[PDB]
Ligand binder design. Structure first.
Ligand code: WD6
Ligand code: WD6
Ligand code: CA
Ligand code: CA
Ligand code: NA
Lengths: 301, 301
């Protein structure tokens, strides 16, 4: 029993993290087989960063401009290329610790684990959700750029995120491992804003089910609502509308607890309209929305 | 910027986790050099578990009763002994992935990372505090016994916890790696209760400093209180009394923010007496007490 913010074990990713240096810019890279992946803005000076033309800047680079370090052992760069916003540096050594992996782009509301790194050295691991406005609320300091987010699925690492930047509001933006940004952001040092965020409704419901599984029941009630009538309360509290597709993935938690999804929605409706009145659910005093139905099942079953 | 529940990278510990089987009992063990550490109650049957005499039960065991598996490769047990509540199984192979390590017992209010494992296979990582009543509020299912908690300090793993049991209230109890229980618990399948818990005051203050560092300031005020006068409000809200020793370790965060500790205590006093009035601090709607001053500095500096 118990319910915690839980990350995947990070070791398979720790063995892939390297330090990539270009000029006086140093960030993290991801070493899989004989290719190192890192944010392309490593090739930028502080002056280049204000308004870079990356095709120009890369064309003016050669392999010997890129210092790669796996621990202390320097890696020799034998080629380089650009994949949208990520730089690919070919090296003369395949990473012997390369796990089975995939590059997958995730959806808003899905979660992943972040291995925060500095100078190619892993420092901490935590869980994140991709917000509906395509930012993540991470924990990142200078030098973390190049850190990756991932899920693990039967010894296969699915890389879904590489960290590129902190926005002025302190939230974080990056790309998938094909270098395609999440959200309407670009890799240049200009003040960019995210769209307005919303609460991930399906995840809050998943977490209410986790609470019931763990014996928290005070928020339950005998009522029910319709899928249509609930969405009217979602709009008012800046929650995502609920889909029959969402209900069906909540199916398993609905079965294990005996609480129909629309029954739980009436509980969420009451929680939204009345607040918690000082009580907690799974040790929290607000409605948590960064646990997916999968996260809940993985931890409660 | 940002502030997250953050664990240590788990890879150094993942390479030490094995499966230990005795009879029909299977749990996790920790393989360092040529010794495997696991909870001694692995030698118990379900009938033995109600009221075990462990010296008897171990004396009736031999090496070939203990099946150890590191992945698929079985480890041959060449000796066994008891260290209080942990069983030591000597094996014929030193773990090639053995990190630099120490066995350290922690204090109530300190934090560590938990690598939750099942059948010797790591499944998730999260952060825990040792509660003042010597339990932890973990996330653990059947088969997790033997999972370890740890901190990492310059490539040295300090093991401080091995998981032995879930109490009837759903909180978790275990030992240090010398097999000495945290708190007034024993390893037998009987209903045991923890003492009444209290809030870790120094940690709440650390977290208020983290919030200020991250730009959350609404709870601040111009007031101040005395060390003595604050403890009177601590007693009323079931908070630990504050020590000058606590203040001095909060020194660095007090300096970096310019907020004297007793100034922050007046803010905590007001938060305790008035509540949050619907507002959040670092994304939480209650006062978090599972971040130490060290945790805050590590993540904010
Ligand atoms: C709350 C608050 C205040 N917020 C900040 O002070 C962070 C500021 C915000 C900003 C954004 C744009 C701008 F015009 C001016 C300021 N942004 C950074 O400093 C970015 C600058 C940057 C570098 C490259 C590209 Cl492609 C894109 C960008 Cl926008 N630097 C990093 O993100 C680093 N690599 C990693 C890093 C450094 C320092 C602090 C955090 C992190 C992280 N994580
Ligand atoms: C909320 C709620 C309900 N709470 C429970 O149902 C857990 C129950 C509580 C209990 C405690 C004592 C008792 F008389 C009767 C019941 N306790 C377990 O089941 C313990 C039994 C046990 C095994 C050995 C020793 Cl030395 C000590 C103990 Cl008390 N089993 C584990 O802890 C397993 N290894 C790991 C495990 C199994 C199942 C569920 C969680 C976990 C964990 N983590
Ligand atoms: Ca209901
Ligand atoms: Ca004050
Ligand atoms: Na974590």
């Amino acid at each position: 029993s118990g319910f915690r913010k839980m990350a995947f074990p990070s070791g398979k990713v720790e063995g892939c993290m390297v330090q990539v240096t270009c000029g006086t810019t140093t960030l993290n890279g991801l070493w899989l087989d004989d290719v190192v992946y890192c944010p392309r803005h490593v090739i930028c000076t502080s002056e280049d960063m204000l308004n870079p033309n990356y095709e120009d800047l890369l064309i003016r680079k050669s392999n010997h401009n890129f210092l790669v370090q796996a621990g202390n052992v320097q890696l020799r760069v034998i080629g380089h290329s650009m994949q949208n916003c990520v730089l690919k540096l070919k090296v003369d050594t395949a990473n012997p610790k390369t796990p089975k992996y995939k590059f997958v782009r995730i959806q808003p509301g899905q979660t992943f684990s972040v291995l925060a790194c500095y100078n190619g050295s892993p420092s901490g691991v935590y869980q994140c959700a991709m917000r509906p406005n395509f930012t993540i609320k991470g924990s990142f300091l200078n030098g973390s750029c190049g850190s990756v987010g991932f899920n693990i699925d039967y010894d296969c690492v699915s890389f879904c995120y590489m960290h590129h930047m902190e926005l002025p509001t302190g939230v974080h933006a990056g790309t998938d491992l094909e270098g395609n940004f999440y959200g309407p952001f670009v890799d240049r040092q200009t003040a960019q804003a995210a769209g307005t965020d919303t609460t991930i409704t399906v995840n809050v419901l998943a977490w209410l089910y986790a609470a019931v599984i763990n014996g928290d029941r005070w928020f339950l009630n005998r009522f029910t609502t319709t899928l249509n009538d609930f969405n009217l309360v979602a709009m008012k509290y800046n929650y995502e509308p609920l889909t029959q597709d969402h209900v069906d993935i909540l199916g398993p938690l609905s079965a294990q607890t005996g609480i129909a999804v629309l029954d739980m929605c009436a509980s969420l409706k009451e929680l939204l309209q009345n607040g918690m009145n000082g009580r907690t659910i799974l040790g929290s005093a607000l409605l948590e929305d960064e646990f997916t139905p999968f996260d809940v099942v993985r931890q409660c079953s």
